Design a protein around this ligand. Structure first.
Ligand SMILES: *SCC1=CC(C)(C)N(O)C1(C)C
Lengths: 13, 314
């Protein structure tokens, strides 16, 4: 359900 | 005042700037709806959340799947890759290419790691708070940012909880998204042994002129009381009564857990009963709400604040 804000951006569902 | 630089970290309005007992000093949108969330700049040493009428402790994952909310905790649910809880070494490895993050101290790093998880997969400034546990060196992102829901009306299917210092919490640290990277320099941590907070007047450190005396068996109990009385961003006890009678309890639970902003009047901005002079001989926690501006040498005293660890002295 979450997306990282710092690069590299990543889906963490 | 020769004390100005030394005492700056005790100007909790300035250095922390939000509630301590309940920190909900900002609002942020998630999918276009505003929610309250923590914003204090200092770490809160020894704070946790007690879940009433439940055996579950608050660092358990929030209830998901078929679990009721009242039976879970506050923390992030397990993810793949697993990002909460995460050890300090795990966080340093995760951010090893980012020189702006990888060497932060444990508390700031945990705050920044929690603030990395955007709940708006499509856009957002909403940043979860976190708890760093010094015992096992683990950062727990808190999915639930609420800190108290314990009024007489429903507190049941109700999820009832309150913030506290507690022996069980002494290694926990409650961290908003705004914890500053130099909190070691600008925020309280240690209690000051053989020292009493005072007010500097005309070249002398005078006693706080009005204090509120609460008995306390030891320093921990005094720190716990100061924390209970400290700056807080929601009321301890929430015709308006008639209209409250039409509300549904389960809907209310959800509001109390996720905090849709749909109330700046409640924000303390750090004002409150944040300090206490503990007299260990008379077992008095002398609690006050104005910032101290000097110290008095007095072997009967330990100076504590709501942010300070409940045990450590220097
Ligand atoms: S994917 C479902 C979901 C998204 C988000 C906004 C982060 N919410 O918190 C949940 C977990 C409900």
């Amino acid at each position: 359900c979450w997306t990282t804000r710092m690069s590299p951006p990543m889906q963490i569902p | 005042n020769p004390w100005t630089e030394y005492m700056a970290k005790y100007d909790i309005e300035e250095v922390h700037g939000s509630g301590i007992r309940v920190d909900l000093g900002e609002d942020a949108e998630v999918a276009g709806t505003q929610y309250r969330l923590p914003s204090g700049k200092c770490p809160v040493f020894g704070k946790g959340i007690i879940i009433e009428n439940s055996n579950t402790t608050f660092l358990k994952p929030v209830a998901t799947g078929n679990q009721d909310l009242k039976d879970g905790g506050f923390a992030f649910p397990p993810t793949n890759p697993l990002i909460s809880p995460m050890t300090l070494n795990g966080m340093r490895d995760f951010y090893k290419n980012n020189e702006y993050v990888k060497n932060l101290d444990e508390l700031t790093l945990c705050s920044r790691h929690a603030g990395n998880m955007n709940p708006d997969n499509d856009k957002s400034n909403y940043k979860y708070p976190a708890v760093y546990d010094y015992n096992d060196k683990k950062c727990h992102i808190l999915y639930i940012a609420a800190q108290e829901n314990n009024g007489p009306r429903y507190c049941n299917s109700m999820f009832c909880f309150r913030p506290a210092k507690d022996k069980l919490f002494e290694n926990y640290t409650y961290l908003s998204k705004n914890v500053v990277d130099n909190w070691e320099e600008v925020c309280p941590r240690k209690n000051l042994e053989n020292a009493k907070f005072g007010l500097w007047v005309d070249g002398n450190c005078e006693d706080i002129p009005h204090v509120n005396e609460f008995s306390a068996n030891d320093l921990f109990e005094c720190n716990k009381l100061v924390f209970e009385l400290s700056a807080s961003d929601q009321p301890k006890q929430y015709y308006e009564k008639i209209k409250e009678g039409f509300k549904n309890k389960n809907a209310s639970m959800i509001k109390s857990a996720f905090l849709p902003t749909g109330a700046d009047r409640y924000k303390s901005h750090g004002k409150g009963y944040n300090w206490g002079n503990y007299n260990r001989e008379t077992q008095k926690c002398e609690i006050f709400n104005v910032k101290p501006t000097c110290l008095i040498n007095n072997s009967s005293y330990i100076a504590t604040t709501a942010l300070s660890h409940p045990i450590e002295v220097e």
